[PDB]
């Protein structure tokens, strides 16, 4: 029969009948390229840290979504507050600089 055991850096010991127990340790030789492109970096850390990478990536995306939505929401809020004083006054100066920063 063939038996497959998971071995970590903490080590694993196995005893085959009437033989002295043998101890083996796994090295950090997972496949990937931590110095390559983003798809290669994530693969390396996923293979080395499966759960941490999954949790880490979700946290990064969640942070980006909240920050980008908040950033754009404030910028949209800026345009509404910045332009409204001129929307209600058709006969207004409306400086050209306004059309470049608040639009």
């Amino acid at each position: 029969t063939t038996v497959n055991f998971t071995v970590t850096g903490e080590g694993l010991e196995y005893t085959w009948g009437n033989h002295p127990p043998k101890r083996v340790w796994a090295q950090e030789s997972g496949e990937g390229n931590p110095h390559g492109w983003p798809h290669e970096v994530v693969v390396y850390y996923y293979n080395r840290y499966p759960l941490t990478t999954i949790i880490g990536l979700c946290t990064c995306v969640a942070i980006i979504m909240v920050s980008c939505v908040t950033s754009v929401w404030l910028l949209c809020r800026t345009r509404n507050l910045c332009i409204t004083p001129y929307k209600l006054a058709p006969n207004a100066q409306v400086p050209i600089l306004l059309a470049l920063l608040c639009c």
């Binding site: 950090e28 997972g30 983003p38 980006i64």
Partner: protein, 441 residues
């Protein structure tokens, strides 16, 4: 000079340090544990083994009857069977056809094998912790002695006074109750003396293997002899010691966490890699040499020529130097980034030397101490090729050990970019807020 530090509770992985006594050149210190033994206090509760049933000659009363009496024997049974007409080699034993009785007796004994084949039930309490420590320092060769890991009792090893602090973890693989059979130890909540059940582990119990007061609990029942036959038949529950030996399961020797090795003389758990060990060693004053009496090392430049973050000493570094009064100079890395294989080097007035190191870091950056001097070593390390090795890691892995410069760059952009987006939104809000004020004013 007393040196105090904390070393991990690891066996076979040496602890290295430089003992720096003000005014004297550093003395390299190396402390290696040969074994660590958790030796609990044990109280034998009772001894269990396979029973033997003793059956004395039955009393055959012809043309009459007899009566049973109680006796002080373990699981003693006695019964009188009337209406027997036994036959022997010489013919009918009794004259009367039915007015005859046979009184059968039986009781339980320890078998002859009980002197060698028995299980010992122990109560286990906190005991002591001992270790074998192998120590070398300076130019003194390796010396070792057995020590008590309690932080109080000193040990004299090669003119050095060693006090090994108590283990930071009070963890022990033994429960309050263990059973020792042969070389194997089992964590087993054995029944109290006098309460063992028939066909189970405690059916037969003895306070000691040579006692004369034995507890036995088997369904020993005398059966009626077969017609015309003189014998003492009985039924009994099969021995629970033989049953237990079949259903023992995995011993503590095979399931103990932290790699503990279980030994019996005395009962102890060896090499359990739990916690850390405070240490304090008093180095002889004669082992220290004054700074002005040792070589001066300067102009150090460290180059990593090869590196892989394998469990072995996969790193190779070359250090260029200039010095004076050529002679031996200890080498040490105070940080945990890299473990140095060499303990000392011989320095000329100028040249370079090489050393090997073990690191888990993908981009190691560590300080190397060269007696009275230090240099910073930096480089990149490639992944190890072997998936599985038969030896433990020399280095220690940190949270940030695996993070590459590329990964740090992406994290820096992630945090910097995320912040920059919010900052622009906040700046725009502040600018418009002021403009709204100036409109009214």
């Amino acid at each position: 000079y007393e040196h105090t530090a904390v070393m991990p509770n690891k066996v076979g992985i040496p602890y290295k340090a430089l003992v720096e006594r003000p005014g004297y050149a550093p003395v390299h210190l190396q402390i290696q544990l040969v074994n660590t033994r958790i030796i609990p206090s044990t109280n034998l509760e009772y001894i269990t083994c396979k029973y033997k049933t003793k059956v004395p000659s039955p009393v055959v009363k012809c043309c009459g009857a007899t009566q049973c009496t109680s006796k002080p024997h373990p699981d003693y049974q006695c019964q009188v069977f009337s209406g027997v007409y036994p036959f022997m080699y010489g013919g009918a034993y009794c004259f009367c056809d039915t007015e005859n009785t046979q009184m059968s007796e039986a009781y339980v004994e320890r078998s002859e094998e009980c002197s060698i084949d028995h299980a010992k039930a122990y109560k286990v309490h906190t005991g002591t912790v001992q270790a074998m420590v192998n120590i070398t320092y300076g130019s003194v060769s390796w010396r070792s002695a057995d020590v008590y890991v309690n932080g109080e009792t000193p040990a004299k090893i090669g003119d050095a006074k060693l006090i090994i602090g108590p283990l930071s973890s009070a963890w022990s693989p033994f429960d309050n109750k263990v059973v020792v059979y042969g070389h194997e130890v089992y964590n087993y909540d054995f029944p109290e003396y006098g309460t063992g059940k028939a066909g189970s582990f405690g059916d037969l119990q003895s306070r000691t293997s040579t006692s004369n007061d034995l507890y036995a609990n088997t369904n020993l029942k005398l059966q009626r002899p077969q017609a015309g036959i003189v014998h003492t038949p009985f039924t009994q529950v099969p021995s629970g010691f033989e049953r237990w030996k079949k259903d023992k399961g995995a011993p503590l020797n095979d399931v103990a966490p932290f790699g503990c090795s279980i030994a019996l003389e005395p009962l102890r758990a060896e090499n359990c890699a739990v916690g850390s060990i405070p240490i304090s060693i008093d180095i002889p004053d004669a082992a220290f040499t004054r700074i002005s009496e040792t070589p001066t090392v300067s102009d150090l430049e460290c180059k990593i020529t090869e590196c892989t973050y394998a469990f072995d000493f996969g790193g190779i570094a070359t250090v260029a130097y200039k010095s004076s009064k050529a002679g031996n100079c200890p080498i040490h890395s105070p940080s945990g980034v890299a473990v140095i294989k060499e303990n000392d080097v011989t320095l000329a007035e100028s040249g370079s030397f090489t050393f090997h190191f073990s690191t888990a870091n993908i981009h190691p950056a560590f300080k190397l101490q060269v007696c009275t001097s230090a240099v910073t070593c930096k480089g990149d390390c490639k992944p190890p090729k072997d998936h599985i090795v038969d030896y433990a890691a020399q280095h220690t892995e940190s949270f940030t050990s695996a993070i590459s410069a590329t990964a740090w760059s992406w994290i820096k952009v992630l945090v910097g970019g995320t912040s920059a987006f919010i900052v622009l939104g906040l700046i725009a809000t502040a600018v418009v807020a002021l403009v709204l004020f100036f409109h009214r004013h």
